[PDB]
Amino acid sequence: SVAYSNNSIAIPTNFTISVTTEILPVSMTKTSVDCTMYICGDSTECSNL
Amino acid sequence: KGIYQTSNFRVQPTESIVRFPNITNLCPFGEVFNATRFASVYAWNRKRI
Ligand SMILES: *[C@@H]1O[C@H](CO)[C@@H](O[C@@H]2O[C@H](CO)[C@@H](O)[C@H](O)[C@H]2NC(C)=O)[C@H](O)[C@H]1NC(C)=O
Ligand SMILES: CCCCCCCCCCCCCCCCCC(=O)O
Ligand SMILES: *[C@@H]1O[C@H](CO)[C@@H](O)[C@H](O)[C@H]1NC(C)=O
């Protein structure tokens, strides 16, 4: 509860130097896919289809 | 101009091998398909091969 009044003010007499962390992702892993290897791995009939 | 992903490095087979068990005898084709008597269908005979 803030002690509000029409003629009262609160003024700081000191200060705190505070250091905080913010962590942000920037990049993800780059991937490549060989379709023939994934679907028809070393099968000539599957590769031809 | 640039760098392009190609297919993964393929190695072709050099020879074909076949590995079957040490089996000598022929299956009893004469006993199965040339039996003198055959069972009735209600009492059908089962033979292990
Ligand atoms: C303002 O705040 C600082 C730190 O919050 C006060 O410094 C401390 O003062 C006490 C008492 O003199 C010491 O025991 C601490 O070692 C001090 N800390 C540091 C980091 O210096 C300072 O006294 C405050 N000033 C006023 C006017 O309130
Ligand atoms: C004597 C029992 C043999 C058991 C063999 C088990 C493996 C199955 C292979 C096929 C055997 C029967 C093939 C029949 C040949 C048919 C020829 C035709 O089309 O006239
Ligand atoms: C089938 O059985 C008959 C009667 O025993 C025989 O004459 C014939 O040679 C047999 N055939 C084969 C392929 O074994």
Side-chain angles (χ1 to χ4, degrees):
Chain A
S1 203
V2 186
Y4 180 80
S5 178
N6 66 340
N7 62 340
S8 177
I9 200 167
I11 281 172
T13 66
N14 210 338
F15 41 83
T16 293
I17 301 303
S18 122
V19 176
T20 50
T21 62
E22 178 166 22
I23 296 133
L24 285 173
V26 169
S27 66
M28 62 202 246
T29 82
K30 322 147 79 183
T31 58
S32 203
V33 167
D34 202 324
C35 265
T36 313
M37 188 135 300
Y38 180 77
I39 303 165
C40 300
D42 282 323
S43 164
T44 313
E45 304 97 333
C46 197
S47 299
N48 291 331
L49 287 175
Chain B
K1 186 191 55 165
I3 172 167
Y4 301 87
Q5 308 291 314
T6 45
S7 280
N8 286 14
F9 186 78
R10 306 285 174 147
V11 175
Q12 298 305 311
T14 56
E15 54 188 294
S16 296
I17 67 162
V18 177
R19 303 297 286 166
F20 273 19
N22 293 334
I23 307 158
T24 36
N25 305 319
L26 186 74
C27 290
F29 288 107
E31 278 170 29
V32 169
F33 297 93
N34 205 42
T36 311
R37 298 281 316 81
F38 261 57
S40 295
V41 62
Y42 85 102
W44 50 274
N45 179 265
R46 169 158 282 202
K47 177 186 182 44
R48 169 114 192 123
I49 309 288

